Amino acid sequence: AEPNRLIKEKSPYLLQHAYNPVDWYPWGEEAFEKARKENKPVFLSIGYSTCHWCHMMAHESFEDEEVAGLMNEAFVSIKVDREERPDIDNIYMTVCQIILGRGGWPLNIIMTPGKKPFFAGTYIPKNTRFNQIGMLELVPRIKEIWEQQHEEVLDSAEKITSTIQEMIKESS
């Protein structure tokens, strides 16, 4: 077990994810420079240590080698502790509310290397359910949209539209 970068953090919440197979970064410019260099979207996950659905998602998805593998191909992934960066939490909760018309934790935001969001989700189960896409299906879909409808992604990010959110919704 070789740890990810969250091994350096003080937050018990962040330290608890330091052995996830997701190659997590903390919030910082390193993650965003990596995303820019590799031209990958950023997957931002915001949670806190008494958040039931954050633990559920860690247990089902972020500890899962298959999900993590897909996340590591698709994204630069960033973990934020709400209790340490409440400012960042409020910024992204607002974005989630704009796109989804609701909000909560865990807060999952997919954004451009320049930090422009184009997808939001709250708890996302590993496997797809009726009217609720799962992580195993979501991540490859997002990767494909990024690679093949890149201009639609940039347009959506620039104007905070729901077009990508709606593409994924239609996916089934």
Q: What domains does the chain contain, in order, with CATH numbers?
A: 1-172 (3.40.30.10)
Q: What share of the chain is helix, strand, coil (3-state, %, to 5)?
A: 50, 15, 35
Residue written as token pair 């093949």: 148
Distance CA 106, CA 54 (A): 5
Residue written as token pair 């350096």: 8
Structural method: X-ray
The structure tokens listed for 4 are: 């990810």
Listed in sequence order, the DSSP H helices in the chain are 12-15, 29-38, 52-57, 65-74, 86-100, 135-148, 150-159, 163-171
Nominal resolution (angstroms):
2.1
Cβ neighbours of residue 4 closer than 8 Å, sequence gap 6 or more: 17, 18, 19, 20, 22, 23, 24, 25
**Pairing mode, if any, of strands 42-47 and 107-111?**
antiparallel
The structure tokens listed for 1 are: 């077990």
**Which residue(s) pair with 116 in the sheet?**
none
Task: Label residues 92-110 b or e (16+ Cβ within 10 Å = b).
Answer: bbebbeebeeebebbbbbb
Residue written as token pair 């420079």: 33
Distance CA 32, CA 8 (A): 18
